[PDB]
Amino acid sequence: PARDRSYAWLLSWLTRHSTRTQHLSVETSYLQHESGRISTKFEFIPSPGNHFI
């Protein structure tokens, strides 16, 4: 389930093991530090549906 913390770990492991995943979603890590410093990074995650590995 999404409540368990293994969800994100398994999804990251999937997106690493299967580099060429035609179907995927995006997770953006955005953090505006003090003094107006903006840090952004795109983490790509498998899209909802069926995937084969």
Partner: protein
């Protein structure tokens, strides 16, 4: 691209850092002209220090660096510090050690709890050293390990003779620089900055006339004189002899 960076000043009350005022517009670095290559040297040193954190941690040396700027008043020290902080996207934590409100322990606590990715500026360093107030307590507190990652500290003073060579050492002030009066290159750079587009020969003549008239002309005086003849380059050039 629609977000404009800002510089935040952190003031100190009691034993805490507070966000003084509102976020300020970042002054462009090229606006402040100190010397031929002092700005480049300082920027390069700061970039090298920041971009190599693995060097310090592996050798077990504190990730702390300090700079000192000594010169005549009104030479553009604090302005350059603000411009550098804006370029590095850091925040300046201005603190006046000349005030007797803070003590040596209070100074150490404030310097140890400084916000991350933030610069700390301690002006009028001569006053405390000349004399709550202490002369060696501040330098002892500076060498204390009570700090955070990348504690960049800037020293600014009107004169350096009042201090001692013991202050300048590794683990302390590292790259001291002397800011001086305007030169021909500095004067022509200021003239072309204030007035966007004119004859370079006119700027050279202006700089030569100013150098002939005054030997210890300060950039603050130059800016004040330019304010008098705002949007008036020819009148300002004709009025150089008026300054004498």
């Amino acid at each position: 691209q629609q977000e404009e960076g800002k510089t935040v000043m952190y003031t100190a009350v009691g034993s805490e850092w507070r966000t003084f005022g509102y976020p300020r517009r970042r002054r462009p670095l090229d606006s402040v002209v100190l010397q031929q290559g002092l700005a480049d040297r300082i920027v390069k040193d700061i970039r090298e220090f920041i971009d190599n954190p693995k060097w310090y941690i592996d050798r077990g040396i504190p990730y702390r660096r300090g700079y000192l700027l000594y010169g005549p008043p009104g030479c553009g020290k604090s302005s350059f510090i603000t411009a550098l902080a804006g370029e590095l996207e850091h925040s300046i934590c201005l603190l006046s050690l000349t005030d007797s409100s803070l003590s040596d322990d209070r100074l150490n606590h404030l310097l140890s709890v400084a916000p991350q990715q933030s610069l700390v500026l301690l002006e009028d360093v001569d006053a405390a050293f000349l004399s709550r107030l202490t002369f060696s307590g501040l330098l002892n507190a500076l060498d204390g390990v009570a700090s955070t990652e990348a504690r960049i500290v800037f020293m600014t003073t009107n004169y350096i003779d009042r201090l001692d060579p013991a202050l300048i050492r590794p683990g302390r002030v590292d790259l001291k620089e002397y800011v001086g009066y305007c030169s021909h290159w500095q004067l022509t750079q200021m003239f072309q900055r204030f007035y966007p587009g004119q004859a370079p020969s006119l700027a050279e003549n202006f700089a030569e006339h100013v150098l002939k008239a005054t030997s210890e002309i300060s950039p603050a005086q130059v800016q004040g004189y330019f304010m008098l003849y705002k949007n008036d380059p020819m009148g300002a050039v004709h009025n150089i002899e008026s300054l004498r």
